[PDB]
């Protein structure tokens with residue numbers, strides 16, 4: 001792909017984070033803590049899952065960023081509407097305002113309803129995410145495999161401003177403590 005020149009500097013919004021997350025001082029990394037991180041509750045925090053939003057809002061144009069997923073067993077990545085549900089249980093779907101892919105139990109899937117199997121020969125250590133607001137496209141790229149395409153959501157109906165979306169995943173196994181990291185431009 002040749003989307004690299006639309007690179008944007010994403011930072012994480014602490015106020016949206018689940019209360020167990022630890023976001024680095026530079027707001028570029030996030031990991032699961034082993035306990036509640038001693039913050040007040042608010043209506044923006046994702047309550048049931050270890051999720052956090054980027055601070056940036058996009059309503060036009062072309063945007064690109066990269067995320068490091070090295071040695072994680074589970075995670076979700078993509079974009080979502082600014083007005084997605086924060087509290088309780090929900091599925092990641094375009095009907096609920098999410099355009100995402102994930103790793104779970106040794107398989108990769110796109111967050112359609114129902115979910116779609118992905119075909120990845122080289123497990124990625126970094127993921128590229130491209131959004132074309134006007135075209136209604138969200139695409140995912142395997143940076144470890146020379147930028148190969150993972151998945152394209154087309155005919156997207158965003159229906160609002162978009163925010164970068166992250167889930168570090170649960171750490172029931174003791175094998176999923178590693179962080180998500182926003183990679184430098």
Ligand SMILES: CN(CC(=O)N1CCCCC1)S(C)(=O)=O
Pocket residue numbers: 018020032033034047048049050169170171172
């Ligand atoms: C289920 N987790 C503990 C927990 O209750 N929380 C952390 C995750 C978000 C909800 C809050 S664990 C064992 O760390 O994956």
